[PDB]
Paper text:
Reversal of PARylation is predominantly carried out by poly(ADP-ribose) glycohydrolase (PARG) in nucleus and cytosol, whereas ADP-ribosylhydrolase 3 (ARH3) may play a role in mitochondrial PAR degradation. The mouse PARG catalytic domain has a bean-shaped structure, with the active site in a deep cleft in the middle on the abdominal side.
Among proposed PARG inhibitors, adenosine 5′-diphosphate-(hydroxymethyl)-pyrrolidinediol (ADP-HPD), an analogue of ADPr, is probably the most potent and best studied one, with an IC50 of about 120 nM. Under a new crystallization condition, we obtained a second crystal form (space group P21212) successfully soaked in ADPr and ADP-HPD, and solved the complex structures by molecular replacement. ADPr or ADP-HPD binds to the active site cleft of mPARG. The signature catalytic loop (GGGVTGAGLVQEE) interacts with the ribose ring of ADPr or the pyrrolidine ring of the ADP-HPD. The second conserved glycine rich loop (GCGAFGGD) interacts with the diphosphate group of the ADPr or ADP-HPD. Upon binding, the second conserved glycine rich loop (GCGAFGGD) undergoes a major conformational change to tightly interact with the ADP-HPD. The side chain dihedral angle of Phe895 rotates about 120° to form parallel π stacking interactions with the adenine ring and subsequently close the deep pocket for the adenine ring.
Numbering used by the authors: 444 to 516, 524 to 955
Amino acid sequence: KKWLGTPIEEMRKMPRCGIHLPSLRPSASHTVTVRVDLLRAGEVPKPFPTHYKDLWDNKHVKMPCSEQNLYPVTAGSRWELIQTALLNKFTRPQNLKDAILKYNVAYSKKWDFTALVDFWDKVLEEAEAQHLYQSILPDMVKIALCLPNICTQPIPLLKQKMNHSVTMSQEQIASLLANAFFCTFPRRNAKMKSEYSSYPDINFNRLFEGRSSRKPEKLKTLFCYFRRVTEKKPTGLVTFTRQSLEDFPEWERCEKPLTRLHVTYEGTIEGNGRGMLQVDFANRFVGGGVTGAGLVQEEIRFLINPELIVSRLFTEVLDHNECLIITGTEQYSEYTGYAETYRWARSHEDGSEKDDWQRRCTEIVAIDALHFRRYLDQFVPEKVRRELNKAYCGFLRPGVPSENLSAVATGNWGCGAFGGDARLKALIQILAAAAAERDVVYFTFGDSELMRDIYSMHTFLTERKLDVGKVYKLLLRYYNEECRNCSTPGPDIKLYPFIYHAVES
Ligand SMILES: Nc1ncnc2c1ncn2[C@@H]1O[C@H](COP(=O)(O)OP(=O)(O)OC[C@H]2NC[C@H](O)[C@@H]2O)[C@@H](O)[C@H]1O
């Protein structure tokens, strides 16, 4: 049997479980960059304000089209330099390289474009390369240079400790990412960098470097997205929300019961978690190394839903008590394989429903697990409380009643690159969801024994009526009784057998 637990169709999904969405209006906590009054279905949103307003300070994104974006000639407008550079024709890779370097002269010998030249000549066919520079690259420049006219409102930086949302259009995002592709964002490339050292990289320069055989598949995935939005302008909105909690459960005395579980070894979070809160196994610098090296769960999601990539422009590094909730992004590509075997399969027509704010019903939460430098560290109670607290922040929607919350679609969070133990992390998530009072759909990603063990454990704890606080205390018991006074890196018994034994006595 390929799944276990509650049947998947008894789990709450959006937009069916949701409360009627109230009128979309700006707020001290909500930035909205489009004309709400003119917002209609299938209609490309209008910007608000109508004409470019500029801020060049330490609270908002520094835009390439700002008058204060200067370069040494006397002080010259780098924006005029960007327009000059890109309005040239592209016949070969060198002409895009030389164009991008005109306004990034400091990095003229730190930036390699080997992956791009190979993609242009070797990987793509002639009719594919010809279509790239005669249609796709020109149409990318048009939307990039229209940034002033499309992004009229300053975009606020989502800093540590801020509970704030920014609601933006897909066309606006299209423009920003087009600018990112051409590496136009100022003050965002420094290594010794001061101001944006706590933000992820935004400019795409590293997408052209290296001799990795997966660089072309990243380009294909992004050029699939760019080709799409260029041809037919997208009409949706995307909300990015930074959540930062101060009051977490007192886990040891939490009387809340466990909730329902559906767990399967077939399918994926994105493929089979439609209308559910889909977890992104993030880096605290959101997006990971999507714009560079790195091609695992987060990056892949960031590439097939590239409108997530723009979050890197305004999202400060996540502290332990924080997550980034992105609602509205569209999936543009399909893929095969994973990491070194990842490949772009084809375009994907997203058939998701949209809400009263014209966002696609796709909620993604970025929560960073801890990167454990050795296996035994994660069982230390403070590391357990941290991961619980991170997941709990990822799942909790205060302001929404629990019966109006979808299930969470998640998986082996923290247990790939970050060396976590899936059984420990599964239980952590199940406990987090229970505190947040939501159901869990778990994808073990091809692992059947893990599915059985997770189900059996959930069932055992449910039928003995043990609450969050009792299970938490068992985890603290596991460390003290079997991990603390431990001879070699491994203890004499694993977590699950310990729980079974300790509860049965
Ligand atoms: N699409 C999908 N669905 C469900 N499960 C998946 C999927 N893709 C991968 N996985 C499973 O999740 C596991 C964890 O993936 P990984 O990307 O290693 O997550 P980590 O949290 O360990 O890694 C965090 C780091 N990696 C990329 C980020 O930028 C972080 O720096 C991985 O081993 C797979 O078993």
